[PDB]
Amino acid sequence: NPKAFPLADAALTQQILDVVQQAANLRQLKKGANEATKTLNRGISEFIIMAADCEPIEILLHLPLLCEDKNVPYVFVPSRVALGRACGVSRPVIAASITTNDASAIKTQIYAVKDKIETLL
Amino acid sequence: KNKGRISRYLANKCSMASRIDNYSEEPSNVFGSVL
Amino acid sequence: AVTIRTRKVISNPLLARKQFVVDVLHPNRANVSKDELREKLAEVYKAEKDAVSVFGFRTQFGGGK
Amino acid sequence: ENPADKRRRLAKQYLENLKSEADIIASRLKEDVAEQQGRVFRYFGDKLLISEAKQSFTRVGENNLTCISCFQPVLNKYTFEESSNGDKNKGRLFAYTVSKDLQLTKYDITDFSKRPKKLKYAKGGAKYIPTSKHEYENTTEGHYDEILTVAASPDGKYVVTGGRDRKLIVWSTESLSPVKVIPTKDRRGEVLSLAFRKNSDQLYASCADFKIRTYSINQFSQLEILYGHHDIVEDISALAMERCVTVGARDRTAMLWKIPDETRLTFRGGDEPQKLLRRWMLFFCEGSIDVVSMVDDFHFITGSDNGNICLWSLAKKKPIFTERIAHGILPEPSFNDISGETDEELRKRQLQGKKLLQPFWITSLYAIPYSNVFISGSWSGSLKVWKISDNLRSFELLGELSGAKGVVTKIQVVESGKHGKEKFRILASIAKEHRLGRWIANVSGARNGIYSAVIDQTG
RNA sequence: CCAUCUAUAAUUUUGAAUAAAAAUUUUGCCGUUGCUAUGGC
Numbered sequence: 001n002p003k004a005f006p007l008a009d010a011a012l013t014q015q016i017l018d019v020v021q022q023a024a025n026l027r028q029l030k031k032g033a034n035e036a037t038k039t040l041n042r043g044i045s046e047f048i049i050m051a052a053d054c055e056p057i058e059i060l061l062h063l064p065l066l067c068e069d070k071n072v073p074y075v076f077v078p079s080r081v082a083l084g085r086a087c088g089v090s091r092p093v094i095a096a097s098i099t100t101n102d103a104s105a106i107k108t109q110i111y112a113v114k115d116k117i118e119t120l121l
Numbered sequence: 122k123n124k125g126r127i128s129r130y131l132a133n134k135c136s137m138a139s140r141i142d143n144y145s146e147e148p149s150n151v152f153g154s155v156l
Numbered sequence: 157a158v159t160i161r162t163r164k165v166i167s168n169p170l171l172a173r174k175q176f177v178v179d180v181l182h183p184n185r186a187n188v189s190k191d192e193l194r195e196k197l198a199e200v201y202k203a204e205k206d207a208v209s210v211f212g213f214r215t216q217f218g219g220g221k
Numbered sequence: 222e223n224p225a226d227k228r229r230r231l232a233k234q235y236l237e238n239l240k241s242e243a244d245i246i247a248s249r250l251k252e253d254v255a256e257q258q259g260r261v262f263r264y265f266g267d268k269l270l271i272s273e274a275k276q277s278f279t280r281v282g283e284n285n286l287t288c289i290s291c292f293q294p295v296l297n298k299y300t301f302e303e304s305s306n307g308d309k310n311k312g313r314l315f316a317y318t319v320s321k322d323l324q325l326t327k328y329d330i331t332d333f334s335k336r337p338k339k340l341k342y343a344k345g346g347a348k349y350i351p352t353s354k355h356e357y358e359n360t361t362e363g364h365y366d367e368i369l370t371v372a373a374s375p376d377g378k379y380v381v382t383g384g385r386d387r388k389l390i391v392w393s394t395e396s397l398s399p400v401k402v403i404p405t406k407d408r409r410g411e412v413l414s415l416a417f418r419k420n421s422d423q424l425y426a427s428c429a430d431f432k433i434r435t436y437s438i439n440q441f442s443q444l445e446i447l448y449g450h451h452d453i454v455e456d457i458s459a460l461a462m463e464r465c466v467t468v469g470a471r472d473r474t475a476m477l478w479k480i481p482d483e484t485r486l487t488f489r490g491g492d493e494p495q496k497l498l499r500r501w502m503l504f505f506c507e508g509s510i511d512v513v514s515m516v517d518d519f520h521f522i523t524g525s526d527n528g529n530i531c532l533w534s535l536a537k538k539k540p541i542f543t544e545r546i547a548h549g550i551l552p553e554p555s556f557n558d559i560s561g562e563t564d565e566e567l568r569k570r571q572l573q574g575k576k577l578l579q580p581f582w583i584t585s586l587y588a589i590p591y592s593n594v595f596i597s598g599s600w601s602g603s604l605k606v607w608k609i610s611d612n613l614r615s616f617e618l619l620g621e622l623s624g625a626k627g628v629v630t631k632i633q634v635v636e637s638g639k640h641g642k643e644k645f646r647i648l649a650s651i652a653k654e655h656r657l658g659r660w661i662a663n664v665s666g667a668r669n670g671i672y673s674a675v676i677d678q679t680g
Numbered sequence: 681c682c683a684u685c686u687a688u689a690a691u692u693u694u695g696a697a698u699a700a701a702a703a704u705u706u707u708g709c710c711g712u713u714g715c716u717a718u719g720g721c
Contacts (some may be wrong), residue, residue, distance in 0.1 A: 056152055058560060
């Protein structure tokens with residue numbers, strides 16, 4: 001019913017933020033709504049993490065539309081302050097994208113969170 | 122060159138303004154004004 | 157700088173001594189000579205250098221310890 | 222007048238002072254060595270008067286004041302000489318502050334009634350950027366990136382700073398002149414926290430490359446690197462013993478390092494809202510541990526980004542006591558900003574009730590050594606003072622100090638007066654932004670300055 | 681770095697007095713609010 005949906009719980013959010021941080025160190029993370037949008041167009045995204053406290057929320061609502069057309073899982077986290085900190089940058093982040101790489105060192109972790117997001121949807 | 126930077130800056134803000142309008146049932150002008 | 161640590165210290169009055177394992181950290185150095193280790197151990201334990209004995213030093217692979 | 226006779230004179234003259242000040246004498250002499258036994262011996266929580274504390278805020282020009290370190294001379298019982306560097310500095314208290322503006326400043330805090338008084342400062346800039354671009358050649362005298370930390374040597378002879386330029390510059394206290402630069406010699410070795418071993422020249426530096434470095438300031442040399450953390454070592458604390466404790470942020474682990482034994486103890490929170498809610502029949506999962514302070518050689522406390530203040534014991538790997546949402550919940554986002562809808566009810570639905578609410582982070586956490594009182598900080602707008610139970614199995618909120626407005630980057634406490642009657646001054650650096658980054662939204666009314674609160678004991 | 685020596689500042693003698701002279705020892709910027717404290721960037 002709310003525009004930002006599904007919203008991950010406290011337990012799920014930490015695991016998402018964990019994977020985001022590891023992907024950042026491995027250069028497997030695309031930060032920002034614009035960069036996330038490009039990944040969806042290129043079909044190189046594992047899943048999209050969005051911040052549900054974006055002010056206004058509408059400036060990232062095109063991503064769910066692109067995700068559902070492309071069958072890419074997506075999930076909302078409560079805070080953009082927390083998402084930006086996990087992303088590794090010094091500024092809040094409203095959207096981020098995990099880049100597809102079957103030869104990554106964090107493959108198992110990504111698919112674990114990817115499955116739970118799919119269950120959430 | 123300075124003219125191009127304003128054009129790029131305005132294009133980014135125009136993109137966000139379109140998002141607020143499209144994905145809002147009853148869009149307001151409050152955010153466009155501050156933008 | 158060089159660090160010297162003693163561990164597994166046993167007081168042995170049967171042989172009238174203290175026995176211990178000496179770990180030496182020597183970053184950016186090949187190793188520490190037995191004479192210099194004896195000097196520093198003598199200062200640390202407040203004993204004559206002639207009463208200090210050190211042996212069996214093996215450097216860790218990769219150096220530094 | 223042999224050296225033995227000189228000690229006897231000072232020791233005799235020391236005893237005469239105790240007799241003048243005053244069973245009582247014998248107890249006091251034990252208290253002189255209570256520090257050597259790593260147990261809490263300063264039970265003054267109930268005697269503190271938080272309500273009557275004289276609070277003041279001192280503004281500073283520097284933008285985003287990042288850390289504060291205080292120096293208090295202490296009488297050395299073994300030689301009966303004050304730790305002051307020289308005769309001029311007898312009984313003079315100093316505080317050193319650093320900021321993201323690349324400025325190091327020293328203040329005088331000796332007079333509790335008066336505000337901190339600036340004495341000297343040193344500022345960096347682009348002139349100090351190294352031309353070499355090689356890590357071992359990063360030996361420029363000044364800083365050229367954000368300064369994150371500062372620590373004052375216990376002997377009063379040096380003050381050491383570090384930051385995002387991957388250097389460890391040690392300055393002379395009197396003139397703030399750099400005397401040595403010690404590069405971390407790592408690509409990502411940014412210094413995030415500094416802690417001096419109490420009454421010693423040994424310095425512990427936590428770095429963003431997931432390692433802890435130990436230095437000897439008197440010898441101006443690096444000694445050892447400690448490994449084991451899986452993420453950035455955000456904070457570090459030390460006491461008289463060599464047992465420094467550290468927190469690794471996102472890996473959510475607190476580690477205690479036994480430097481002589483070359484062993485480490487790992488502590489992990491392991492709390493889950495599902496069990497917390499069921500036992501109750503808003504709980505937030507832990508994201509990272511950001512702050513740590515050593516109450517004791519066998520106890521320490523940590524603060525996390527979910528607002529949990531945890532008490533730890535070396536015996537137990539799990540926390541012995543936890544204080545959830547210590548500093549409260551963040552204000553709910555405005556409904557006028559969440560969405561662009563004209564209808565108010567539509568905007569309210571985007572708030573999703575209380576699901577978007579998040580707790581305050583514990584940005585600062587300081588415990589007076591070997592005591593039962595510690596102080597926590599955040600950007601809530603107040604400093605909360607807590608008291609630990611006598612059995613050291615719990616703690617309660619002693620009081621609050623609401624003068625502080627802004628992000629509490631670092632907290633320090635200094636005491637003065639006779640042994641029985643002591644006044645405690647709490648100095649906290651306040652900033653408009655978090656020390657590590659600019660994530661936190663601008664807090665209404667926040668200012669850059671040094672918060673001060675003088676607290677008295679009566680009873 | 682410490683000490684010493686200077687410098688700065690305060691009490692005192694001739695002095696209406698200036699004067700000499702021994703002698704000694706809260707902010708980067710912009711406001712509001714007091715005679716001090718907190719609002720914006």
